[model samples]
Target chain A: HCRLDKSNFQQPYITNRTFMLAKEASLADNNTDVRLIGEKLFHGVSMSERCYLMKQVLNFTLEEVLFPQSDRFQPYMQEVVPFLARLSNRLSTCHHIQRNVQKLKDTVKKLGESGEIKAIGELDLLFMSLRNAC
Target chain B: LKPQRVQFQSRNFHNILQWQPGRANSSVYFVQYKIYGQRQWKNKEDCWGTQELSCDLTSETSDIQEPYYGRVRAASAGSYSEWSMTPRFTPWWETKIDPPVMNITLLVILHAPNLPYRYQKEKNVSIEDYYELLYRVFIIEQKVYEGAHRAVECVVAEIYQPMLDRRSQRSEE
Candidate 1:
């Protein structure tokens, strides 16, 4: 088949980057009172928006794009992969979501080896959001 | 006259708003929908004042996890009728799952075909992404074992000719 045209994707009008920005900003604001802060930061975001973001992160995890394949994280990856696959696959796939995912992955890589914890934090937050939202 | 029996008929998340005419005379119908808690109803542009008895709303209801409501109103000559509405519909919960694609591997003349499991493919991927699925196989062995439904843990076949049938189940959310 030919490369998919943009018109085919009726992606949520708001880009995934916007949500990621909000997430980062929300975290920079504070780590104190996480439960309250999480709710406050995404006050106006709709359920669809939250679902979209969570599904994107879930996809990255399922595809092995988030965690490195090296031994250091392989143990962590295996423990989470099967569960992540089921979660991500259950949601409606966004045809253009890979673009945003790749962008996030790039940023994660840019953060350098020492910032692995931050990368892990983002995935943790997303998984928590998805667990509660469902 | 208003549209009667207004409702959504969905299968595999292909939602369609359908209705019947209140009277046997010619009438055009308009359809509108919105997320459950939202106050403003958005009109189905192509369905506005259309003569068709059904309108496909799949695209508008793209977020399968969210609940939605659809309403239809009838118009004839210069008069319009009250809206006929459907009960809350959540595509994920309401849509029916179809059976998976089936294939068999043939062996001997006295041999039977072994069945393999697969979900209905969407684009190039299987729709198993949409739901948790389990396959049930009904097999008749030479003992007339009257085989009951079994999960596809392993492909099982006896040393004789066998007959098989299958059904698929969508597990509870």
Candidate 2:
């Protein structure tokens, strides 16, 4: 896995542009399959791309499209579904990471108790010693 | 201008009287009589009082039956003397009540979805005890979110176990 830094993060403006394009594509005369594929691609793109696409969708919804009667409405739904799924996936991954980190700490404690790992090397033990000295 | 004072000598009867200047030094007075036992004052003739010079006709009064009058006095050097007209003294009754007291109470219910069943089932364990466990799991220990979720589930299971057992017994019956 690549370590993504702040510099690697997609700019908000790019996301906005993607949003505008997606919105226009949604409103334009397009087949159902094309719109569905476009929406999935929109969600699959990086966070910046998704942000731009979302902005475009919002603009289309507000300015170009005329409510439920508009032909472009179905595409909006198709795009939002995967976007929400990706968000949920990201949240689940975060939770998984946190769970693994705790498990690692627990394993370290067990190893220390069994003398496989020295207790002196443990951060918690070091802090306890420092606290007692203070 | 001269200040004039009029005196009434009637003992048993009350009356209202109006006075108007006839000519230079002379004056004409009209009088209407009222019986002592009557509830309503009689006659439309004007009557002057102690503060007669200052009383206005439109002043509010509790008495509707009494007749009143005013006197116009010529101006003196700089200051006007006493009032030329005074309103009749009317007795009025007014009553007011104190505001009522009120009491209010507020109740709050918080439901935790992820609480463990074990904590819920322990009859002796109070909400405060469960909160202490939660503090240990979430804050002091920094356990995984699943740890907190499992703890809540354990309490919930314990809380419902008796009910579930009763239902099972009913089904068997």
Candidate 3:
């Protein structure tokens, strides 16, 4: 028999702003046409020059910064939050599976070492075969 | 080495007339070219697709540097046969120039004023003082707004009902 501690599982820490930025970056990176254009715009420039160019591109004025929050952030929040929630849920499932697999492996090792079969009649041959295969 | 007797292998071939009805072959044909006085063909640099029965070969392959002749057979069945004429490939030096570069910049800025308050607490400030300061900044004065822009949504959700209830009850009382 194996025991899992529910208290050991911790909720992941994620903020909406970080999640939104990551999603946008992921979408941009996957766009081949946009990537091609981006490549053309930066080609042959030195690292220092590239950094300088980026600074020039992003130097927003105070007027630009003070604008009221737009509805643009809303749509992205809905899309990204659900995606990240699903991803985190899947990751937790994977961790649970990993823990169970480890427990199963330990049980098999213990059974092998003990040699004396306490529940021989209850043990299935297919279970041993599956454990050995794993 | 015995005078190189060049032989070509025909891996697969099919008659055009035997093609299934409603199927079409859209394969490109190419001509080979070689350096002057060279017996062997160098490479194929130019190619054209054929829709008609015959393809024209007007340009002289002799003058073109490192050129070879070949034709690709394509079937509507989504299969393509190998180059028919000869195994000719272009050398590196004669290839086209690189594509244009694309420049992109992304900026993400985060500003948090409460970092100092959090840091001071982390530095072992008394719990009573910490909570007192937190209450004043986060509850009474609402100075948490300065650094909690991203987290405001969650904060708003937590406080909205209590704040509304307090206001309504106060007005009625």
Candidate 4:
């Protein structure tokens, strides 16, 4: 019946660009394993920082804004759409976590929302849990 | 009065363990941990008799590779507090990969006077908050996804009563 306001988000402190910056900052630093070395396993960062960056590259705008119908979406449609063509391919939704997932959980417990600018490595699952919060 | 809420910190930069001490500096804590599904908690001899708020678990805990559970008890006076426990920590695995959130709904509509009283009442059963009821139903059919990132394979039902059983009592006559 109505549209939602920004304040309604569990992370009102998160700006759309906050995620963009995290993605860009890493690439700028010449690190591509943003999900692993740069983000998930990196120690110099924090959870709140990871949560925001997650909203950037892996789960956020790509889902909401990148649509087959949009001109902007068409750019990646050829490359990204084929990934969606097959049932198995469309199901490309998976994770990069290692056998032991506890290491990151321990890191988050130690670092809460404060401290170093750490980005979460486990993107899809990380986005999954935090996306629903008030 | 008690030490509780033991939690682990395993960032490569800082591999430590912490617990909530019931009292201030006056309280000293005793800590130990065991692997998941195991009963014996190996004691960190250094941590066994320490007044510090936190300790390093990597070198002290018996096994770091497997999921582990920890406990801590505080003693400030002759009467000590009970042990506080922590959830098992499985470091390498993803935290929570809940079934992806999705829902399907059914709504019924009919011309009120044309329908019988029972039918009118029955229709209401399907009316309100179909999607809301779906919130807690994380799985559909017998299968849910194996990975946390994959979308849930939900069951969608479609109903169409092409025609009613209008030939009720005429045949009996």
Candidate 1 docking class: incorrect
DockQ of all candidate complexes: 0.02, 0.00, 0.01, 0.02
Q: What TM value does the first chain of each candidate achieve?
A: 0.48, 0.22, 0.27, 0.24
Model 2 Cα shift for residue A116 (angstroms): 66
Error of 2 at B156 (Å): 8.1
In candidate 2, which residue ranges exceed 4 Å CA deviation? A1-32, A36-45, A67-134, B1-148, B152-173
RMSD of each: 16.6, 39.7, 31.7, 20.9
Model 4 docking grade: incorrect
| Candidate 3 lDDT by residue in tens digits, B22-125 | 22334333323332113454343432333332232223221111222233333333454443332221111111211111111221122211212333424454
Q: What is the TM-score of chain B alone in each candidate?
A: 0.66, 0.17, 0.21, 0.47
Tell me the deviation in Å of residue B32 in model 4.
Answer: 0.6
Error of 4 at B130 (Å): 47
lDDT of each: 0.49, 0.25, 0.24, 0.35
Q: Report, to 2 decimal places, the DockQ of model 1.
A: 0.02
- To one decimal, what is the Cα RMSD in angstroms of model 4 from the true structure? 20.9
Model 1: residue B7 alpha-carbon error in angstroms? 1.0
Q: B63 in model 1: Cα distance from truth in Å?
A: 1.3
Query: Ranking by lDDT, best first?
Result: 1, 4, 2, 3
Candidate 2 lDDT over A1-134, as tens digits, reads 11222321123332222233333432231121111112232334454343333333322222222222234334533443333233233322210222332233343344433211111111111111111212
- For this target, which candidate reaches the highest TM-score against the unseen true structure? 1
True contacts kept of each: 0.00, 0.00, 0.00, 0.00
